[PDB]
Swiss-Prot record, chain A:
Keywords: Cytoplasm, Isopeptide bond, Ribonucleoprotein, Ribosomal protein, Ubl conjugation. This is Large ribosomal subunit protein eL21A. There are 2 genes for eL21 in yeast. Component of the ribosome, a large ribonucleoprotein complex responsible for the synthesis of proteins in the cell. The small ribosomal subunit (SSU) binds messenger RNAs (mRNAs) and translates the encoded message by selecting cognate aminoacyl-transfer RNA (tRNA) molecules. The large subunit (LSU) contains the ribosomal catalytic site termed the peptidyl transferase center (PTC), which catalyzes the formation of peptide bonds, thereby polymerizing the amino acids delivered by tRNAs into a polypeptide chain. GO terms for biological process: cytoplasmic translation. One of its GO terms (molecular function) is structural constituent of ribosome. PANTHER family: 60S RIBOSOMAL PROTEIN L21. Pfam families: Ribosomal_L21e. Belongs to the eukaryotic ribosomal protein eL21 family. It comes from Saccharomyces cerevisiae (strain ATCC 204508 / S288c). GO terms for cellular component: cytosol; cytosolic large ribosomal subunit.
UniProtKB/Swiss-Prot annotation, chain B:
This is 60S ribosomal export protein NMD3. Associates with the 60S ribosomal subunit. It comes from Saccharomyces cerevisiae (strain ATCC 204508 / S288c) (Baker's yeast). Belongs to the NMD3 family. It comes from the Eukaryota. Present with 11900 molecules/cell in log phase SD medium. The gene is NMD3. Acts as an adapter for the XPO1/CRM1-mediated export of the 60S ribosomal subunit. Unlikely to play a significant role in nonsense-mediated mRNA decay (NMD).
From Swiss-Prot, chain C:
This is Large ribosomal subunit protein eL29. Residues 1-25 have a biased composition (Basic residues). It comes from Saccharomyces cerevisiae (strain ATCC 204508 / S288c) (Baker's yeast). The gene is RPL29. Residues 1-36 are annotated as: Disordered. It is found in: Cytoplasm. GO terms for cellular component: cytoplasm; cytosol; cytosolic large ribosomal subunit. The keyword Transit peptide does not apply. Component of the large ribosomal subunit (LSU). Mature yeast ribosomes consist of a small (40S) and a large (60S) subunit. The 40S small subunit contains 1 molecule of ribosomal RNA (18S rRNA) and 33 different proteins (encoded by 57 genes). The large 60S subunit contains 3 rRNA molecules (25S, 5.8S and 5S rRNA) and 46 different proteins (encoded by 81 genes). Component of the ribosome, a large ribonucleoprotein complex responsible for the synthesis of proteins in the cell. The small ribosomal subunit (SSU) binds messenger RNAs (mRNAs) and translates the encoded message by selecting cognate aminoacyl-transfer RNA (tRNA) molecules. The large subunit (LSU) contains the ribosomal catalytic site termed the peptidyl transferase center (PTC), which catalyzes the formation of peptide bonds, thereby polymerizing the amino acids delivered by tRNAs into a polypeptide chain.
Curated annotation (Swiss-Prot), chain D:
Present with 13600 molecules/cell in log phase SD medium. There are 2 genes for eL42 in yeast. Gene3D superfamilies: 3.10.450.80. GO terms for molecular function: structural constituent of ribosome. Component of the ribosome, a large ribonucleoprotein complex responsible for the synthesis of proteins in the cell. The small ribosomal subunit (SSU) binds messenger RNAs (mRNAs) and translates the encoded message by selecting cognate aminoacyl-transfer RNA (tRNA) molecules. The large subunit (LSU) contains the ribosomal catalytic site termed the peptidyl transferase center (PTC), which catalyzes the formation of peptide bonds, thereby polymerizing the amino acids delivered by tRNAs into a polypeptide chain. The lineage of its organism: Eukaryota, Fungi, Dikarya, Ascomycota, Saccharomycotina. This is Large ribosomal subunit protein eL42A. PANTHER family: 60S RIBOSOMAL PROTEIN L36A/L44. In wild-type cells, 78% of L42 is monomethylated at both Lys-39 and Lys-54, and 22% are a mixture of species with either residue monomethylated. GO terms for biological process: cytoplasmic translation; response to antibiotic; response to cycloheximide. InterPro entries: Ribosomal_eL44, Ribosomal_LSU_eL42, Ribosomal_zn-bd. Belongs to the eukaryotic ribosomal protein eL42 family. Keywords: Antibiotic resistance, Cycloheximide resistance, Cytoplasm, Methylation, Ribonucleoprotein, Ribosomal protein.
Length: 159, 245, 58, 102
RNA sequence: CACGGACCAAGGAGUCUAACGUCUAUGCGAGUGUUUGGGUGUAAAACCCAUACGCGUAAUGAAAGUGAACGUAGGUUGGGGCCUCGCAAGAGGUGCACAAUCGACCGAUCCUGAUGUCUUCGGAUGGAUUUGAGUAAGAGCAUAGCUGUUGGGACCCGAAAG
RNA sequence: GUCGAAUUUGGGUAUAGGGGCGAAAGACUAAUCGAACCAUCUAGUAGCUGGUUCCUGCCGAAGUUUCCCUCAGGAUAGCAGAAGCUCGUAUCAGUUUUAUGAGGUAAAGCGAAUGAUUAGAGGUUCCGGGGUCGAAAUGACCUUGACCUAUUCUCAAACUUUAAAUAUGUAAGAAGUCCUUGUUACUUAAUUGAACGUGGACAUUUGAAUGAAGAGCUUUUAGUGGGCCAUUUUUGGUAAGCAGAACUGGCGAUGCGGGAUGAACCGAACGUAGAGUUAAGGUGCCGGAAUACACGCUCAUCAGACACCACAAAAGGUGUUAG
RNA sequence: GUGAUUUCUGCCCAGUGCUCUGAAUGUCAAAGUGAAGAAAUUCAACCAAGCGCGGGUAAACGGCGGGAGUAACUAUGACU
RNA sequence: GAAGACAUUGUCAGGUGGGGAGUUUGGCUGGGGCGGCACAUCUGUUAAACGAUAACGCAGAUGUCCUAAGGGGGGCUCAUGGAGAACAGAAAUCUCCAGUAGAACAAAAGGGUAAAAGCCCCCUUGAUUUUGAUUUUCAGUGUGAAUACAAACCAUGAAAGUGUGGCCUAUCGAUCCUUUAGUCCCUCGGAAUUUGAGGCUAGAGGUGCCAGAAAAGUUACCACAGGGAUAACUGGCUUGUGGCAGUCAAGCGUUCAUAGCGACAUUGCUUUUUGAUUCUUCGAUGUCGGCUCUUCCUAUCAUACCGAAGCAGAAUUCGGUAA
RNA sequence: GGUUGCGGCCAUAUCUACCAGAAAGCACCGUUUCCCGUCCGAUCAACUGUAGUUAAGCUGGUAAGAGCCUGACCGAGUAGUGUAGUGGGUGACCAUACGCGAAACUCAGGUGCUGCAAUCU
């Protein structure tokens, strides 16, 4: 009949890679996880212990518990009409940091730097980002540059 | 028409014997095709009478039980013959040639006052049991079997090698030199510290020193039959020896 | 009499009538599941700083 | 399967509370021992007219009982049970396995 | 081209009772409920009353049993209001209800065992990723109504049988 | 048909309902027989069929999950109504940008790993996996075969370097940043770290767009648990108005205008009226509206006429028209 | 149970039934007897019928196949 | 007269007993049966690049085995190929070079791993004790399984370490009842002691229809509630099949593709055959054939008029208008 | 800049072929009493840096090399796809409108980069 095991349908998701077989590089273990940090889940096929279920491949949560081999990760999973709050225990092979959080933390240092310098200047802070704007009018110089007339091409087979 | 042959055993010994025996008498001539299944095989016979010829052949050589059913095809109007496509479902008795078998208490008293703890010898038309300790034979026709079916305690897959030491014949013989005491030991316990089992067997006349025999070793098994649980555990022998080589 | 065994039709439309809404995650999350060596220390550190503010600052 | 006759495991007998040497034997069910409260209620309800008043089980399917080992400390003689997985063959002691032979 | 309906009058189908659930109205409030019964009566009404009983105010344990403040009845985070300041905007103090969290208290389990001791009884004190329908300045009882649940012939009519 | 006998018949008299009687049909026993008639327990039980009595107002479903001797039914979760409570710009969204992850489908690849399938000829201790007899094991017989023994061709839902579109996870700051030093039995060689803090600094551009007939939480119960259709992707099947899935939209509950007619198609969703403009569709007449305007094509001794849609193909023509 | 007469009614006692002037220690309840125990009780021995074994039975129910060989071949409704 | 402490009668016990009574005789399902288990589960695929996703879809597996095939450390390297060696060859043992894993890892398939998770030694019991939190199927209940810690005691290793069973994904079970272990603790309600029985905490005996009933048939003598949710007669959708028509022209017709037969490819029609479906009717459409009687279609057997022939006449064949 | 121990990113670092390498460091190379491991002091142990050498290891250079990694108005706005029509077609499918957008190839270039500590005419 049917089949709903713990690692069903994970033929291509838990493969290792092409030309990345072998033990993991040691800078994976050396990273530091503090409570609250944002993490991404990407299940290493090599280390079977502490390995996430196939749903949580690619999800993103928060560090709340830190133990010897593993980190506590909370992921919001939807079922029915509702968001549950589910807790995981993943070893440090599978977990990895998120650059989208890390680039925000540098942008806070840029924002705090602008405000103090603007205050000594004394006007016009302008801190918010803007989306892309429609471009301004300008003159295009045809000097040394004459327009080249084109035409549609007729049909040829060349088969 | 179809004769559906089945047998509920994982290792079919009786059914392999039928395929050898179906060839010699040349009983299958009227087959259209042959399919296979999980626990047996299917035969396809073009006419109804040719299907009946096979079950009368299976009645003679192998213990069977069968029943028939049909379904409509055409629903003819003028003639009336409505073209029923038949099906015959034949079931082989799940007791093999060398099953160690524990009989029910009412059944074992009815035939020959035999002990409940027996073997099998004559897999042919009616199933025949043999008491290996004190020799005695008892039959079991399928009409006695299918009214109250049971199973086999062990099978032909838990057999253990044994090494015979000497053959001590008491003397009484039915037809194959019965009740000869055999001192025997496993192949396992021989090179290691000395363990000796001493037990009667029917395999007395054909057996000599230094010959390997197969057999059931009861004392290391946790069986789970309630028929076995209604026995007297200080009367059940430790070793039952089945066959030579 | 066969029946339609399973369908997910009209399921997502039933979900969004009330609102998927987030669990809204209050301050001071529960320490159930945290390493009990850490919880045993965290008991005393609060009892220290409450005693430290009480006597020194009033 | 095979288990050795002697196994060193944890004891909790108020004097040891630590690993000591244990002797291993095999669990035996035990006699029915009537005058029990189930049997006294059963014998009363069966007597009379009406016949069988309790279910009589027929459809048995399993083939292996689980193995229970009772473990006896040699020092303080505090017994303890311990179970295994299902198996068709169970013996204890003899036939230490040897990998390389003819 | 599925079933009932020729026409007309009258009859005709979610009712009552016991014990209850949420909600709402009213009295009373750590209490509450006169009406089994007695007193009286313009008499199956009204009016009046003893003492018990009922749930409630302490849980927990399977039981023998024990049985709720280290403290402004605890700290933290918000919190309606009010107070102070301001011309306002705002700032600060206090923060009931409720929501989140770490504690303390009592019972069960588990562990440590002080003075003593009829030498085996007694369990002081301090514990623990455990546990309970607990305490932490009471909120219940009685009546009535909508609805809902169960047993009753239970929305009305209907078997073949025993 | 039979008609002098196992004949026909009156009155008497016996046998009573799991009992009678039967030259045997399950016949007969007061128009009742594979278990009579009457009364009672009795208004016997039903997941089954039919019925269910005034009006207006507001809101408004589901045929799906898990479990059941369960598949015509229940229980639970769903959607729904009512009662409100706390507060009132709180912070949220069937959506986009910005940043950043995850996937192996289309398409590519075989002169990159892997690659079937169609048929199958030999090799008597290069194995035996079985079956049968066996007073045995120098043991026989019967049979799938061991073994492909030089090759010859194929691509891919169950093959992979590379890898889209659509859909999907998280971030875009007050519960935040920075500075200073407090707590402890945790941790460190170490007042090193860890978490939570006191005090001080940073405000309306407080950290992208856009929107918000308020946001958040609780209680309580009705109905439902037979579905269906189409665009598109698909699976078994010769094919279907066939069986089975995926995403959204609708019918069921829904009128109105258009397709002559039609539950789904196109337009558009309804308090009662007046006026103006329109949607899809139409303008010879039935039929409200141009026998308009403009360039061409076709003559049919079965013309042709409007998506869904009520059907027609391969193959021929010195019929005509343009290349 | 067959269904006048004239004629015949073959072979099979094993399966299932029926019966036995047959052999006895396998099965075996209540009461009784024996031991252990403070007693409730626990264990053992003997243990009727029938069952089981052995004999009869088809005008009782009923059933009535196949195989290999035998002076070269052939192999029989024959000898084996 | 005959019999006689036996028979009979009275209670208890074993055997016999369809003569009689009571009841039962699964579920899924292209009608129901037969078979199968899609009934509890596991891998690949269907599956349309997160998750979810159906069919009696496809290729398959499980109810086991293991004191090592579990746990810790150390040393080493595999399949196969090349060249060498008395007996020695296709294959024994020995030797070197090449060797990205083409071998192995208890079993299905898919992952994974090379100074190892493989092979060979060494010591060993962490396959133990206390009990909670979390993940998977999910109602976020169970059962099974799995991860990460804490409080103890150990194993191995020089050590950092790892170890709560098999490298990972399957390998299994409630209440009641019997039984064991632990506390040697609690109760036997007039008060005691010893037996006995009853409790708390934790394992075992099992329900495979696997969230867990104790269960054989027939009805052609049949009964009731219902169902076109579901068959048997017609209708409708479909045309594999059957019928029938075109294209190519193989074989032929001595020597001649098409006077004429026409195998075989390929394009079609129709409902005169049969299947596939189950839309309509089971509170009934009177379900085969013949006799009688009218009308309609043309794919033309005969009649009328023509066309082609391998048509001299005669006799025929092919074909056109024609019902 | 060369070396050595220890690393990080893990083929631009690999593989194949030849050719060089002062100084110092590595590396082969001498032995067997002790420790220990072996059938064998070959590996591992131990002792001497003494007797000997850059021939190997290793490092560097070379190659219209194999591989590998970056770029491209290279292939190519092609393949494929989201949304829309009372668009075409008998069907198969194909155009157009608003959007997104590959791969194989071909060509051009490249052949390790660096952290900590130590050591050398």
């Amino acid at each position: 009949g049917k089949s709903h095991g713990y690692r069903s349908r994970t033929r291509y998701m838990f493969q290792r890679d092409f030309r990345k077989h072998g033990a993991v590089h040691l800078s994976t273990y050396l990273k530091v996880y503090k409570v609250g940090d944002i993490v991404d889940i990407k299940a290493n096929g090599s280390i079977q212990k502490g390995m996430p279920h196939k749903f949580y491949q690619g999800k993103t949560g928060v560090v709340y518990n830190v133990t010897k081999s593993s980190v506590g990760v909370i992921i919001n999973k939807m079922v029915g009409n509702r968001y549950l709050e589910k807790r995981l225990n993943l070893r440090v092979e599978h977990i990895k940091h998120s650059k989208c959080r890390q680039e925000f933390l540098e942008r806070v240092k840029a924002n705090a730097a602008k405000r103090a310098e603007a205050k000594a200047q004394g006007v016009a802070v302008q801190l918010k980002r803007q989306p892309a704007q429609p471009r301004e009018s300008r003159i295009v110089s045809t000097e040394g540059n004459v327009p080249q007339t084109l035409a549609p091409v007729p049909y040829e087979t060349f088969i | 028409a179809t004769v559906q042959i089945r047998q509920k055993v994982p290792h079919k010994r009786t059914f392999l014997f039928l395929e050898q025996l179906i060839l010699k008498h040349n009983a299958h001539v009227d087959t259209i095709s042959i399919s296979e299944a999980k626990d047996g095989l299917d035969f396809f016979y073009a006419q109804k009478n040719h299907a009946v010829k096979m079950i009368d052949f299976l009645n003679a050589v192998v213990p069977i039980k069968h029943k028939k059913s049909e379904e409509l095809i055409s629903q003819d109007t003028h003639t009336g013959a409505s073209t029923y496509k038949f099906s015959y479902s034949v079931e082989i008795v799940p007791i093999c040639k060398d099953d160690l078998v524990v009989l029910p208490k009412k059944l074992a008293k009815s035939m020959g006052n035999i002990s409940q703890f027996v073997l099998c010898s004559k897999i042919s038309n009616t199933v025949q049991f043999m008491d290996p300790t004190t020799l005695q034979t008892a039959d079991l026709s399928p009409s006695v079997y299918w009214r109250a079916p049971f199973n086999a305690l062990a099978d032909v897959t838990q057999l253990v090698e044994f090494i015979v030491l000497d053959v001590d014949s008491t003397g009484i013989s039915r037809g194959n030199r019965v009740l000869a005491d055999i001192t025997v030991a496993r192949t396992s316990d021989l090179g290691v510290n000395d363990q000796v089992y001493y037990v009667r067997s029917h395999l007395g006349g054909i057996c000599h020193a230094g010959d390997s025999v197969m057999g059931y070793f009861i004392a290391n098994s946790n069986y789970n039959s309630d028929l076995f649980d209604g026995l007297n555990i200080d009367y059940v022998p430790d070793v039952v020896l089945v066959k030579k080589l | 009499a066969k029946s339609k065994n399973h369908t997910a039709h009209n399921q997502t439309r039933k979900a969004h009538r009330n609102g998927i809404k987030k669990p809204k995650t209050y301050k001071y999350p529960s320490l159930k599941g945290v390493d009990p060596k850490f919880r045993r220390n965290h008991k005393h550190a609060l009892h220290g700083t409450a005693k430290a503010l009480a006597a020194a600052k009033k | 399967v095979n288990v050795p006759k002697t196994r060193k495991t944890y004891c909790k007998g108020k004097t040891c509370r630590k690993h000591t040497q244990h002797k291993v034997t095999q669990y035996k069910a035990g006699k029915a021992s009537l005058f029990a409260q189930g049997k006294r209620r059963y014998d009363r309800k069966q007597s009379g007219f009406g016949g069988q008043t309790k279910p009589v089980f027929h459809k048995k399917a399993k083939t292996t009982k689980k193995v229970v080992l009772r473990l006896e400390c040699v020092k303080c003689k505090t017994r303890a049970q311990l179970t295994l997985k299902r198996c068709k063959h169970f013996e204890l002691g003899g036939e230490k396995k040897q990998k390389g032979q003819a």
